């Protein structure tokens, strides 16, 4: 848990350094993808030097294998890309290392605020030396929902709207900074009570789901199942609020 985490942390460090460096060339749709590729490539170099056996899984490069196919590196060098496209500073790098059909290492690093959340299965998820103890809410009273509008899954638009309508009738308020990984980190660190989003992808939540579960929370799909890994339908938070949310949101779904 020490060496893998140290390597991942150094990788996220280099990624965040390059990202923040390139964040100072003001321009007013492509160069964002260029620096994305560059950060992904220096991450790839970090993967090749240290442990050249593991395999890499990126939204961009798909999956690039080596010899140890049992150790997958799921590295999103940027989440909430549109923010960095608009200079809105809410974005992070999400490193994940899955071993034996299961996530084991997780890191989410915002270089702007310098937020470096780490997570090993079992021993838990730390932040800068602090332990994330989830949220204290037992229901949907006065709580905050890290809600995410499906700007890539417009098919479920109206369904999602009715769902969030019922929620806001029941719950208190939403938040959306346009960064799934950071949303998961925040709901993990008790900064926002509950979280739920539609149509996500493994390279996005790969680390955040572990960050949440290690914080006395759970991650599931809209039907309590465990296929949210690929169905992109995720609800997360400490179990009280997740139960209180599912009990209200089940009866207006379509999947």
């Amino acid at each position: 848990m020490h060496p893998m985490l140290n390597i991942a942390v150094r990788a996220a460090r280099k990624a965040g350094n390059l990202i923040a460096k390139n964040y100072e060339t003001p321009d007013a749709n492509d160069f964002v993808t260029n620096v994305d590729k560059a950060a992904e490539a220096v991450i790839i170099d970090t993967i090749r030097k240290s442990y050249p056996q593991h395999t890499i899984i990126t939204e961009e490069s798909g999956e690039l294998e080596g010899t140890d196919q049992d150790v997958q590196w799921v590295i999103d060098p940027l989440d909430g890309t549109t923010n960095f496209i608009k200079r809105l500073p809410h974005f992070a790098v999400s490193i994940a290392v899955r071993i034996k059909g299961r996530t084991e290492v997780a890191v989410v690093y915002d270089p702007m605020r310098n937020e470096l959340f780490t997570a090993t299965r079992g021993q838990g998820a730390q932040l800068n030396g602090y332990r994330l103890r989830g949220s204290t809410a037992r229901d949907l009273d006065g709580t905050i929902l890290a809600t995410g509008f499906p700007f890539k899954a417009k098919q479920y638009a109206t369904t999602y709207i009715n769902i969030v309508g019922k929620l806001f009738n029941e719950c208190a308020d939403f938040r959306r900074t346009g960064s799934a990984a950071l949303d998961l980190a925040y709901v993990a660190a008790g900064r926002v009570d509950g979280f739920f989003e539609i149509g996500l992808r493994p390279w996005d939540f790969a680390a955040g789901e572990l960050l949440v579960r290690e914080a006395g929370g759970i991650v599931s799909d809209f039907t309590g199942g465990h296929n949210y890994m690929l169905t992109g339908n995720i609800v997360a938070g400490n179990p009280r609020v997740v139960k209180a949310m599912l009990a209200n949101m089940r009866d207006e779904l379509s999947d």
Binding site: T103, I218, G224, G225, H226, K243, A247, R250
Partner: protein
């Protein structure tokens, strides 16, 4: 620190003396026999009182054994945690030892939570946890 142990050891009358840690009274099995070269240093306990000491010593060993077998059983897989289909007595051992001695807190444990369970794979564990979610969250019963 033995005040709960020697409650009734030399207990034909407790106003004789407190037990002796000069020989130890802290092995309880290798102390089944200590010769009379050192067991003449006790006072106020004649030979019938010595046989009563042996009887109450068997009783004290019974007390320590009972405390052992009662503190061990911090598992208590209950009927509400045994009735669960697919959850036998042994899976109930392992689950109530995992850290959830109930069902409501059980529906609040994911796959990786209930992984490494003796007698359950990953997929069937997930199916059972989903069934527990049906019986605690989805069914909407109380």
């Amino acid at each position: 620190a033995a005040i709960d142990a020697f409650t009734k050891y030399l207990d034909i009358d407790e106003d004789f003396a407190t037990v002796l840690v000069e020989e130890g009274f802290s092995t309880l099995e290798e102390l089944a026999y200590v010769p009379m070269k050192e067991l003449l240093e006790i006072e106020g306990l004649d030979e019938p009182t010595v046989e009563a000491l042996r009887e109450r010593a068997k009783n004290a060993l019974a007390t320590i054994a009972q405390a052992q077998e009662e503190s061990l059983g911090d598992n208590k897989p209950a009927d509400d945690l045994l009735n669960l289909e697919g959850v036998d007595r042994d899976l109930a051992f392992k689950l109530a030892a995992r850290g959830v001695c109930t069902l409501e807190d059980l529906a609040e444990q994911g796959i990786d939570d209930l992984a490494d369970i003796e007698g359950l794979t990953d997929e069937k564990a997930g199916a059972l946890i989903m069934a527990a979610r049906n019986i605690c969250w989805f069914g909407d019963e109380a």
